[PDB]
Amino acid sequence: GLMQFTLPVRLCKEIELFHFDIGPFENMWPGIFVYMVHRSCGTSCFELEKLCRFIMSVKKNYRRVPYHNWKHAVTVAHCMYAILQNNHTLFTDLERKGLLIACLCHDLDHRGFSNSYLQKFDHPLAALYSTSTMEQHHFSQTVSILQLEGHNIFSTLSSSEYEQVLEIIRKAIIATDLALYFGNRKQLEEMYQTGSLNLNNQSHRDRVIGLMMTACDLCSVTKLWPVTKLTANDIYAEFWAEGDEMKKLGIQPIPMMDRDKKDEVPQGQLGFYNAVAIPCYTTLTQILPPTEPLLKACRDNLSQWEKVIRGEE
Ligand SMILES: Cc1nc2c(NC(C)C)nc(CCc3nc(N4CCCC4)nn3C)nn2c1C
Ligand SMILES: [Mg+2]
Ligand SMILES: [Zn+2]
């Protein structure tokens, strides 16, 4: 009850910044997450015993893949934390409760393959879920874990508040399907510019939380250059293993997933920052001004990839 989580001083100060890296000590990630729940939501939000039990079962259901692993889950939750703490009054009590959980759960049981690889392999998940295949799975694993004995962290909520939080979590997790991001971001841009954006309209909030989800999920591009550059190694280790798996099905992979195009990485990062990342954090900053440091950091990393191309890096 009287039991704060505290972090060493450097982590206490730096966890509040958008560019914070959660570090290589796996055993501290649970405490970092509880710390973020306790400050962004409250000591009262969840029973400590249930939360801890929930975090450890969530961790167990992330696999030992190079990028889509437990570190990625906690990284994506910390970016959400920083967004929430910089936009104190913009969010409901339920949203505060739902979104850090959504972020921790958003890639549950990821195998290191894209929706498109499951569809070409003809994985059973692709017949259960014909679009957003992996994301419907992640939401289904979230509900499974919420239903284990002693794991219902939302038990203090009314039946209808419980339904609303599971509904914030579902939409937040589905939104991490980047195929959906392009259209979400365009509609948000149009709505912001024609002044129709209305945060009291639930379908508008949903879109804005969707974009937050993309922003957190891509937050590898918003770190200190050394973190950005080394995370890209992990990202490509997955993509290229998928490439190999595509060639085993007799399919030339897209160049993103072809290890033979190693040498083009700097230029692939450029297109990605111009086509995906910069537009994401640009539109996010328009809607939520205090998130501008994510845009500044993204722009800084774009400029570092340009240096790599010019032979200065
Ligand atoms: C956070 C993060 N998320 C992603 C991401 N997410 C995908 C689901 C689109 N993709 C990439 C790779 C982007 C890329 N590389 C290349 N090639 C590499 C040499 C041939 C072409 N082409 N593209 C488009 N980086 N990345 C980061 C850093
Ligand atoms: Mg995902
Ligand atoms: Zn993710």
Helices and strands, with pairings:
Layout: H1 9-14, H2 29-40, H3 48-60, H4 70-86, H5 93-105, H6 115-121, H7 124-128, H8 133-146, H9 159-174, H10 178-193, H11 202-217, H12 225-248, H13 265-287, H14 292-309
This protein binds the ligand Cc1nc2c(NC(C)C)nc(CCc3nc(N4CCCC4)nn3C)nn2c1C, magnesium ion (MG) and zinc ion (ZN).
Zinc ion binds next to α4.
Bound molecules: the ligand Cc1nc2c(NC(C)C)nc(CCc3nc(N4CCCC4)nn3C)nn2c1C, magnesium ion, zinc ion
Task: Count the beta strands.
Answer: 0
Beta-strand percentage range: under 5%
Provide the CATH topology: Catalytic domain of cyclic nucleotide phosphodiesterase 4b2b
Count every helix, treating DSSP H or I runs of 4 or more residues as helices.
14
The name of the CATH architecture is: Orthogonal Bundle
Q: How many structural units, i.e. domains? A: 1
Q: Quickly give the structural class.
A: mainly alpha
How many whole angstroms does the radius of gyration measure?
19 Å
Written as H for each helix and E for each strand, in order along the chain, the element string is: HHHHHHHHHHHHHH
**End-to-end separation:** 51 Å
Shape: globular
What is the CATH superfamily? 3'5'-cyclic nucleotide phosphodiesterase, catalytic domain
The largest pleated sheet is described as: none
Helix content: 55-70%
Task: Please identify the top-level CATH class.
Answer: Mainly Alpha
